[PDB]
Amino acid sequence: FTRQFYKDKFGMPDLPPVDVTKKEPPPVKQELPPYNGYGLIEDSAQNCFA
Amino acid sequence: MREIVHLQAGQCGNQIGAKFWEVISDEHGIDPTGTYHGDSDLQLERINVYYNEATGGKYVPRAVLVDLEPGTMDSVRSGPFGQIFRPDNFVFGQSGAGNNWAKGHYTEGAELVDSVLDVVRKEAESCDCLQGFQLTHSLGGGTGSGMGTLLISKIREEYPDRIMNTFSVVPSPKVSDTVVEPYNATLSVHQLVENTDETYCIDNEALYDICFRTLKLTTPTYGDLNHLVSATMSGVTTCLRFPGQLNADLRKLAVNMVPFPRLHFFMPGFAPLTSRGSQQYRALTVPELTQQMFDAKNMMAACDPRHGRYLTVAAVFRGRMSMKEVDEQMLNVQNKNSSYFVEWIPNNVKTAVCDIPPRGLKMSATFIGNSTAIQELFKRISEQFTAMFRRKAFLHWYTGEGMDEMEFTEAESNMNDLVSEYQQYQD
Ligand SMILES: Nc1nc2c(ncn2[C@@H]2O[C@H](COP(=O)(O)OP(=O)(O)OP(=O)(O)O)[C@@H](O)[C@H]2O)c(=O)[nH]1
């Protein structure tokens, strides 16, 4: 309503809103401490999670 | 020069021969093919303790395989390193094992011992001067026992001046699968102890307990167990091939460990086995190394030495160490449990410090100690043998093969003598 009121009464062109928000990057998940040599390259993954 | 030739016997002598040789080859950077890819000058320099050197830089492992059923030999053959093994050494017979100690000791071996002896003395002549031979077999396993008893018996007179190092798997006390296993064990142990000087006792249950405890992986393969035991053996092997302050000699260990003529049976233990998050959750300090190093749970041979004490102990450590930390930890362990050792020889501990680390982790070690930790094992086998023999079941097979029970009597007699000797010395 404001930006259509201005376009005729005060005769105002377009003024789009500007994103005034604040942002942050994302983090990353914990990976696997590499193959110790004593385990299994696929089962030790499931084992060493939580 | 000092060097060693390997013998793998039985259908688990296969097991471990495969795993052990492949582990060493990966340590030394030899490809699965054989073309040496030199990256560690020292191991290139001292490869001769195990390996001859062939053209173009491949190295025969001076190891010999013995079995009866060609399928297992072909399977290990098919393994990633059967090509680095020998068509030369691939001697084998035609019969079926029958899992029969009697047949193995009298029928089947009677046409294989000849050829295998020819091969082994061929290799002995080929090389300069052995320290001896390491033989990997089973005591409960039928044909492994049947072969190995006769083989060691003959090589005893063949060379009375070398190291007959033997490695044996103890039957799971909870189950032997094969029900004649106690009979095979009582048959074997007599000649085993009579002929050998040093014997390694290992049991499957404790390795399974380790797998639950720190491996925590819940999906183990006997191959993973073999991976462990290969590292175990490598631990005591590293000394000879490596420089720095360390008494490497197996005869050194023998004269520092073996108090009496007939004490031979020893129990292993090893150093950091890294868990799920201990990789980044464990600080590698001599205190914690010794802490886990001398622990009941990490022990994996037979049964908790909580009941008994330790006659004598020996420990070798791989990495950049110094004497003060091992010294002070020795003081602490002596002053902590003044009773838990035998007064029979004060300061019953031996140390060794390999300068060379393993490839990937900084500090490792090997434990080996002689204790009163076999009483329960052979008393167990005593009750089993007595209970099954009192009605002489499963014995007509052996009568057909040509046995009699007087040898059973003398076997159990010698074994009870071992019990009595242990008890009277320590207790
Ligand atoms: N590589 C390998 N070895 C095994 C495995 N499972 C058990 N073994 C053990 O290895 C033992 C020893 O085998 P051998 O020394 O070849 O015994 P044998 O005189 O040839 O005759 P058997 O006792 O009937 O096998 C067997 O009794 C098994 O208990 C496995 O899954 N893989």
Tokens 């080929």, residue located = B126
Residues 6 or more apart whose CB falls under 8 angstroms from that of B101 comprise B142, B145, B146, B180, B183, B184, B187, B188
B280–A contact, CB cutoff 8 A:
yes
Cβ burial of B194 (10 Å; 0-12, 13-18, 19+) is middle
Resolution at which this structure was determined, Å: 4.5
| CA pair distance B377, B422, nearest whole angstrom | 13
Q: Which amino acid is at A31?
A: E
| CA pair distance B54, B67, nearest whole angstrom | 27
Q: Which of B221, B276, B361 sits opposite A48 (nearest CB)?
A: B276
| CA pair distance B336, B395, nearest whole angstrom | 52
Instruction: Please say whether the beta carbons of B376 and B302 come within 8 A.
Output: yes
Ligand 1 centre and the CA of B323: distance in Å? Answer: 42
Q: Name the packing angle between helices B142-158 and B181-195 (round to 10°).
A: 10
Q: Got the DSSP string for A5-49?
A: HHHHTS---------------------PPP--SSS-TTHHHHHT-
Instruction: Please say whether the beta carbons of B37 and B29 come within 8 A.
Output: yes
B321 closest CA partner among B365, B368, B369: B365
Q: A40, B224: Cβ pair inside 8 Å?
A: yes
In angstroms, how far is the first alpha carbon of chain A from the final one? 54
A33–B contact, CB cutoff 8 A:
yes
Q: B231, A38: Cβ pair inside 8 Å?
A: yes
Residue B203, SS3 per DSSP: strand
Per the structure block, which two tokens stand in for B36?
């040496």
Sign of CA dihedral B253, B258, B263, B265: negative
Per the structure block, which two tokens stand in for B186?
């009582």
Q: Whose CA is nearest to atom 27 of ligand 1?
A: B141
Scanning every residue of chain A, which has its alpha carbon at the shortest distance from the alpha carbon of B219? A43
Give CA B37 to chain center in angstroms: 29
Ligand 1 centre and the CA of B216: distance in Å? Answer: 25
Alpha helices in B84-221 (DSSP H): 101-106, 113-126, 142-158, 181-195, 204-210
| CA pair distance B271, B260, nearest whole angstrom | 28
B35 closest CA partner among B56, B21, B12: B56
Interior CA angle at B264 toward B263 and B270, to 5°?
A: 125
Q: Which amino acid is at B74?
A: D
CB atoms within 10 A of CB A35: 12
Buried/exposed B282-293: b ≥16 CB within 10 Å, e otherwise: eeeebeebbebb
| Strand B364-371, strand B310-318: pairing | antiparallel
Instruction: Please say whether the beta carbons of B69 and B58 come within 8 A.
Output: no
| CA pair distance B261, B417, nearest whole angstrom | 14
| CA pair distance B245, B319, nearest whole angstrom | 12
Instruction: Please say whether the beta carbons of B171 and B140 come within 8 A.
Output: yes
Tokens 């030495």, residue located = B305
Instruction: Please say whether the beta carbons of B301 and B202 come within 8 A.
Output: yes
Mutate to test the interface with B, among A31, A42, A43, A46 (most CBs of B within 10 A): A43
Residues 6 or more apart whose CB falls under 8 angstroms from that of B260 comprise B421, B425
Tokens 């190093």, residue located = B293
Cβ of B13 less than 6 Å from ligand 1: yes
